[PDB]
């Protein structure tokens, strides 16, 4: 089924119906007035961030054997992996761009819902996810609550509850134990038969929308267009 969409729910409603039970939801009317929503174009990103060095993941999926990480300027990333017919998929993923470039922080806001957590605002981790159509983050789970805010483009997102972990065949190794062995959109059902019947939620996340990903909820993400998302990891 689909992830529910709610317009600006009260803190108490979000707490009781979503945060405490650990249920995903899309929040509307919360981030649609970030300055980023109108300001962030490729040209703006080049002007504010183009000369800075960022880590770039190169390859279809971080679970691939050919996949690698490199360093380049934001201008180089845009030129090589977005605008010119790219030779490979590149992704500026999982990067604390707003600590690197404080000016961009003025264009976003931490959702007020984060104040319901038991952690300090100073410990909230804010990451940028910027890349072309077709980037894929394989199915994985994270150790904190997350608000994933879509600024540019759309993403297809599949969510599996922690209760379904046995059907998702987590990797055995330490570096990948938070990651599924299954390719969500083309699963090997001969090797991973339990995956076929595992229930899930899905959505297309569009600009101005926030997806709440409960702590430890398994999530898979594919960009459908040139995309920029901002995540807030909080407890």
């Amino acid at each position: 089924s689909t992830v529910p969409r709610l317009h600006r729910p009260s803190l108490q409603h979000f707490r009781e119906q979503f945060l405490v039970p650990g249920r995903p939801v899309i929040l509307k009317g919360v981030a649609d007035h970030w300055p980023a929503m109108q300001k962030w174009s490729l040209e703006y990103i080049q002007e504010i961030a183009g000369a800075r060095t960022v880590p770039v993941e190169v390859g279809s999926r971080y679970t691939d054997e050919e996949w690698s990480q490199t360093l380049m300027t934001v201008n180089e990333f845009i030129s090589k992996y977005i605008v010119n017919e790219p030779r490979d998929v590149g992704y500026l993923a999982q990067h604390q761009l707003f600590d690197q470039i404080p000016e961009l922080k003025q264009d976003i806001s931490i959702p007020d819902y984060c104040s319901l957590g038991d952690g300090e605002e100073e410990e909230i981790t804010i990451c940028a996810w910027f890349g072309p159509q077709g980037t894929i983050s394989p199915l994985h789970q994270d150790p904190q609550q997350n608000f994933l805010v879509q600024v540019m483009g759309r993403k297809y997102i599949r969510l599996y509850s922690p209760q379904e972990s046995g059907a998702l065949y987590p990797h055995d190794t330490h570096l990948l134990h938070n990651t599924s062995q299954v390719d969500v959109e083309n699963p090997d059902l001969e090797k991973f038969p339990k995956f076929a019947k595992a229930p899930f939620l899905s959505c297309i996340l569009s600009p101005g929308e926030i997806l709440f990903i409960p702590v430890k909820y398994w999530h898979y993400v594919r960009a459908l267009d040139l995309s920029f998302s901002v995540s807030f990891w909080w407890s």
Binding site: Q69, A93, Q94, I126, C127, S137, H140
Partner: peptide, 5 residues
């Protein structure tokens, strides 16, 4: 925020 370590 990493998933790739």
């Amino acid at each position: 925020c990493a998933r790739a370590y």
